[PDB]
Amino acid sequence: QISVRGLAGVENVTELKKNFNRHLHFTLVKDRNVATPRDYYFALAHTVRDHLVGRWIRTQQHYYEKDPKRIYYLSLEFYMGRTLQNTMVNLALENACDEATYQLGLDMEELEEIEEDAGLGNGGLGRLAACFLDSMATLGLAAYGYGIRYEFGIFNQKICGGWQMEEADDWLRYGNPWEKARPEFTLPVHFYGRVEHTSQGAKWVDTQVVLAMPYDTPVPGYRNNVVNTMRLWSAKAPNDFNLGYIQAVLDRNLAENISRVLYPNDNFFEGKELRLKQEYFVVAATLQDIIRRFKSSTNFDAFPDKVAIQLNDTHPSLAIPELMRVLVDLERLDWDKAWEVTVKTCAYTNHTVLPEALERWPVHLLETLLPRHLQIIYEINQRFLNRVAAAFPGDVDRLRRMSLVEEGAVKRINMAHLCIAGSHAVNGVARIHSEILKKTIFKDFYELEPHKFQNKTNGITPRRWLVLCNPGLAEIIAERIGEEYISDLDQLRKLLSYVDDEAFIRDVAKVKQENKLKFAAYLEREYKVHINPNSLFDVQVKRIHEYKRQLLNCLHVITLYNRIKKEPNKFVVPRTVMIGGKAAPGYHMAKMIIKLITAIGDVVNHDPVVGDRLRVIFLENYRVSLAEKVIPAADLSEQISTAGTEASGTGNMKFMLNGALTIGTMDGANVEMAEEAGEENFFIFGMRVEDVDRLDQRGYNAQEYYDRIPELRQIIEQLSSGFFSPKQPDLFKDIVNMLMHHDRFKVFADYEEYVKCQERVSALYKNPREWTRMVIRNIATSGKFSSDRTIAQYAREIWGVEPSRQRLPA
Amino acid sequence: QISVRGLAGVENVTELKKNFNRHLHFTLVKDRNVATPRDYYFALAHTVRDHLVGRWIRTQQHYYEKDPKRIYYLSLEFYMGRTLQNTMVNLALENACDEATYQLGLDMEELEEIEEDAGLGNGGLGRLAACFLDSMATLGLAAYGYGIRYEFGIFNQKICGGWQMEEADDWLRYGNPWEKARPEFTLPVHFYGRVEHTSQGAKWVDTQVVLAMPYDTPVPGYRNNVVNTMRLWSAKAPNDFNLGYIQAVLDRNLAENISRVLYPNDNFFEGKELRLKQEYFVVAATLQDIIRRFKSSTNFDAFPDKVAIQLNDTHPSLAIPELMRVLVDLERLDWDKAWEVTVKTCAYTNHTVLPEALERWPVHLLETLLPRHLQIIYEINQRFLNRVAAAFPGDVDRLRRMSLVEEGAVKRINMAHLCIAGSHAVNGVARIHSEILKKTIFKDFYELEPHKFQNKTNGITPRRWLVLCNPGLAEIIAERIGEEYISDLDQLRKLLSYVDDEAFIRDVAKVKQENKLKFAAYLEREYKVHINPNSLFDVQVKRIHEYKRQLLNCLHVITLYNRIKKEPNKFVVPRTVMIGGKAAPGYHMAKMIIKLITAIGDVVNHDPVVGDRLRVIFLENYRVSLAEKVIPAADLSEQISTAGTEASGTGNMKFMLNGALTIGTMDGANVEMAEEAGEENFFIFGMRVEDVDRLDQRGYNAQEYYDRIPELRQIIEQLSSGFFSPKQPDLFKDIVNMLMHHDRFKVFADYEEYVKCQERVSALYKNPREWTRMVIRNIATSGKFSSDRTIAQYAREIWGVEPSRQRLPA
Ligand SMILES: O=C(N[C@@H]1O[C@H](CO)[C@@H](O)[C@H](O)[C@H]1O)c1ccc(-c2ccccc2)cc1
Ligand SMILES: O=C(N[C@@H]1O[C@H](CO)[C@@H](O)[C@H](O)[C@H]1O)c1ccc(-c2ccccc2)cc1
Ligand SMILES: *Cc1c(COP(=O)(O)O)cnc(C)c1O
Ligand SMILES: *Cc1c(COP(=O)(O)O)cnc(C)c1O
């Protein structure tokens, strides 16, 4: 149908159809009289997986022969989404499969919708891991994703009476055709025990054993025939476990609970034992695998020449003392040499700014669970603090601040401090964030070891986030400038010479309109709610958190509603305001915010005076596959975190790539985005970081804004009085209370500038041609935010490997 | 190589090799440089499964079009063993696969050994279910096996210091290629709740839901292209289950524990709630499936014309009140019509004689778990007892004896009484057993409804138990009389005209010798123990139970040892005595018997005066695939249960088919076996049933035998004094105590006749030609004990369907 989706050759189509029918018959054990659409999806999925297999085998063979330096991306989260369409895109198979399935009387798009998301992540950090795997394969890096195969991913969100209800994401119920169990590579992981000291050093004994069984998932690069591996570990009990009889067999589940469920918190540390077990489990099994692969290339001096281990936040920070344990206790290297190897191997990416997001594990937990690792940590700390003392003699406070061990009622290990000490590189995820790490959060560490601190600004894969989710936009771009941009996104700058081309202006606006019609129809069939597709699509999608300030958006929504009610016969630009995201099950305030959003919708969407001029929709179950639908349909991207709180953001980049304008603060990657596009093509508002600090010094008094802004006072009275909750008039008194007395994120401080900037957006939307010309300037300068750029920088400045765009043989 | 294993055509072999390599590449994602032998097995298993698929689809299609009466075999146990070789045999693929694999440089026999047994059964009852499925497919019956897919089957037995240790049978660790998950046919099963009575009858409400997910396994008939289905249910939690958050997800395991593990007791009732849940789970899910299939053929009068439900013991007896519940509460039939339908649909096979084997469920358990079923049971009982009263007016004792409800400290439901009341047929499993049911155990029920009681003598499939496990014997038979006997085992009578043919005598003895050499070598490689293969192979394999009298065998073994030590320079026929079997984990006495066996071995096998004349081997981990090796190697089959205690036995039949002579009591099917072969070709000894009764009436005094038999007294003193346990002299005092004061099974009463009969066996073994002529007379009259005969009788006399040997099209 469209060029970027590849060729549908007569021999390709014939062979796909034949293999589809072979899989339906032999693999699925169905004929066409009893086949459900689910069977059709599985037949297609198996048919496409078959095209991966030879490339996957030959790529793993190639790495054995060449023996390149190997990159191990350790993460507790991989937010992969669906695999079928992505696999088709990267193998140039999409049109051929479309044609093949069409000839069998099937709609491929309908079959694609049957696939479960692999929702093994919470949000940005997990999705970054996924984009990164794609980019590493596309740049021909010998890279391995290592994580946990959770039986239950991020929960499925249902809305019941406007409240979030959580249900279990049983994503493996029907089978995962993309994974391959590798039970032959099963490895023991140890827990508990105690440490004996002998003649020949320390010995970790009397441990409980849990087995780690790996599952391999292919990660195809973009049309280069490279297929890398994501290896996810599953927990299995050994067969002698607890071995009255029946109960011993049933208790096998205690050990297997390790890989049962993803912890569903965004930027919040919960110090639970099960979570610690997950962290050690992935680290122990992965390091044995890395070391085994290294011995099949005595001499651990070459280990950092052949191995790079990237730590995706502190969640796998135990890799550091585990590598030390293996090298010292098992391989019998002296401490100093082992430490040299460890520091040169490991690198740490920080994603965090809020102090409640930092992992600080109670010492009593580590003492019980990982007694040897605690000893190694203490030894690391002592030696580290001796360097600090020698560099800053007499600075006793610095010693206390920099310690890996925090004193207090409960002693804790600061895992971030551990990562900095034991890594040769520490990076933030956007320029402003990496600067904040150097200036404030890790200032002391920066002064000791300035050379460690880098920036690597985040990115997104333009395969999933453009070609896959927005084929129509990809095509019109490809008509003008060719297909090379898909793996070299900087080439989008060539679109700047089309900013005054009427045909291209018309095509860009037409694709957007088509995407809005398609998303409006999706809301009709799946959720039975009607939206005006001529309205401006004002979208805020991301996890629900106070720092992300969905509440600021709510205040604007209510402001528009009250303005309409005040002057009902005045023209306003119509809006559909869509807000979506999951709240962590324990985060009471996030759950109240969801309830406020749906309660606003209950008033606004049923007011006959409003009409189709304003609609508020809570998008249920926001996940990777919903982002693929809603982002291409958006006009306005809401990126409105309090300055200094969003480390980078990546949603922001997805929207920029797909033809939405951005309203946002100078936070995270918004700053770099505005810099690339020009500030005049960005709706910037609010306090800068420096303004937030000035406010903190003198003190944030929310009452002052309430006293001075009549429009704001009205909204607070409506919330307080039960205007949005007539049956329970005090329902939202916690939200009012927080805003007035305990707001860490200064919602009122940015209110006035936000509402005003929102008026400028509405004004620009009245002029479709100039709106679209500004959109083109955004898309045209989105190139920097390809994860290919990001990974090339990791590769050159941290891992010490050159990326390649050369194809392996087919 | 040999004719009964089928043709190895050039096109067959070429196509198998090509598909083996396709599966190795695409299915397993390996090349030949990294493939483990496990991969080779899986590639072969997938290659063979592909030949099942079209027949399986076409057979299920054929049953939809013809709409024959359907047989549902409900069992909590299916002891299937390995599937690969059986599938090859029944598809005539064995030689072609042998050739194909040989040309790829692989030994098929080595690959076969990698397959895990499906050990979803304890012993005879479970193995009967498996043989029956094979026979039902071979006789072209529209039959379905329904059970539970246990994650852990019968435990793997290890011997440690002569003691049994149990470990978990993690048979699904590497995947089961033979099953096909059918998540689309998932069904709810209810537990707990309470009963509301309304205008429109009873309503079972406030229940907990567990999902039943079916897995289908193909059951090929012998070369008829029929492939029937075994459907096993797995327990799954619903996604709203317990839905703080993390704990709710982890608690999903409580519901899924239902299908976790097989209860490992042989002829012993343990009234545990989890076991009751298993029984209801298989019954509820199966009956919904039966009813759904029946509605795709209002009118439940035709239900017994289209459905037969066979109850394999009382374990699925809840089918009776569940069928009533569905018909009365959900379909709104009146009670009497529903009961007519139920009785005509259901039939009950009894396997039991010992009172501790009968299921008697406490009323408080049923009250909590299945409150509606308890009501239905009470109503069934009341109406049943009104019939008894009217037929036997004034016989108050009969009412008490026949009640489904047993009075006592704890009130109980007798499930056997329920089965008799609610079934149109009740059968025992051998003639003597079925007579004992009529004369003693269910005498009262027989007097009420004589027409219900039948016999169906057990059998064994000669596919697995001859062609598969003893190809060499099958071949020499086939040289003389052709291949037709494999599905018409009565044809073995033609071998009686070869009883004086020297060539056939030599061939029969040669095959036996080859099998003994092969089994002797197996003990060498896998268990490092050396046996004289010129010795008589004296084998007792079966579960460890007091009633089976392994202890009687031990007494004989010790007798021979003491006779040798008394007169060391006298000739004795050499013996290897092999005893094998698992003890139930809680059965202390069974575990002591294992320990005694290995302790006898410790003395006997290391005495230099004994030499290779006597060896005692405990065969570890007795299971279906070990029976396939040891049974063809046996000379003497030990079937020595106290008369009246072994309902049938089936091991006995396996040995007779494979060229062993039998030493045994007139118990179970031994009686019919001796009758078929002639008593002169059988080593019969001991008390008959009538003799046991005479002993019980006057009282069993073990001391009397101890006082009168010097050889027995010596053995008891050796056990008591620590002769077999020098380090713990009192180790076996529980065994001595039981034998002397509390022996239910009268071991000493049969001792003298057993030892004497054992001397006659030794005498016949000195004359190889006459030994082999007697063997031929046994094999030649083993035809009756084909499960094909057994199933044809179930079919005609209980289910009302004609078996067919006509082939479906290929
Ligand atoms: O997703 C996260 N962070 C996001 O990372 C992306 C990618 O760099 C940034 O764009 C974004 O600004 C930032 O918020 C995240 C971080 C820590 C935990 C966590 C988990 C367990 C315990 C403690 C914290 C859970 C989630
Ligand atoms: O395997 C069994 N019985 C055997 O059945 C075969 C086939 O008919 C006969 O040849 C043999 O004589 C007889 O012993 C068996 C019966 C009940 C339970 C059981 C399970 C749970 C609770 C209570 C009893 C467990 C096992
Ligand atoms: C990109 C993405 C995120 C992260 O978005 P932010 O706006 O950076 O928080 C979260 N969830 C999903 C499903 C995504 O696709
Ligand atoms: C046939 C068989 C049995 C039953 O044997 P009995 O001698 O009748 O108890 C038990 N276990 C296995 C593995 C079998 O093959």
Numbering used by the authors:
A (entry chain A), B (entry chain A): 12 to 254, 261 to 314, 324 to 836
List passages from the publication reporting this PDB structure.
GP is an allosteric enzyme that catalyses the first step of glycogen degradation in the liver and muscle to produce glucose-1-phosphate. GP senses plasma levels of glucose to ensure that glycogenolysis is halted when glucose is abundant in plasma. This is achieved through allosteric binding of glucose to GP and stabilization of a conformation that enables the inactivation of the enzyme. Here, we present the structure-based design and organic synthesis of two new GP glucopyranosyl inhibitors as well as the kinetic and X-ray crystallography assessment of the new compounds.
Within the series of tested molecules, 4 proved to be the most potent inhibitor with a Ki of 9.7 μM against rmGPb and 19.4 μM against the pharmacologically relevant hlGPa. However, the two compounds bind significantly different at the enzyme active site and the biphenyl moieties point to different directions as a result of their meta and para connection, respectively. Instead, in the 4 complex, atom O2 of the linker forms a hydrogen bond to the main chain amide of Leu136, a hydrogen bond previously observed for other acyl-glucopyranose derivative complexes. Structural comparison of the rmGPb-4 complex with the rmGPb-2 complex reveals that although the glucopyranose atoms are at almost identical positions at the active site C1′ shifts by ~0.4 Å to best orient the biphenyl moiety (there is a 47° inclination between the phenyl rings of 2 and 4) and hence the hydrogen bond of N1 to the main chain carbonyl oxygen of His377 is lost (distance in the rmGPb-4 complex, 4.2 Å). However, this loss is compensated by the formation of a hydrogen bond of O2 to the main chain amide of Leu136. Therefore, it seems that the 15 additional van der Waals contacts (applying a distance cut off of 4.0 Å using the program CONTACT as implemented in CCP4) of the terminal phenyl group with the protein residues at the active site are the reason for the 8.3 times lower Ki value of 4 with respect to that of 2. Furthermore, despite the fact that the two terminal phenyl groups of 3 and 4 are inclined by ~15° to each other, both are involved in cation-π stacking interactions to the imidazole ring of His341. Thus, the structural basis of the variation in the inhibitory potency between 3 and 4 seems to lie within the energy cost associated with the significant conformational change of the 280s loop triggered by the binding of 3 but not by the binding of 4. For compound 4 the congruence is even more striking as the docked pose and the observed orientation in the co-crystal structure are identical.
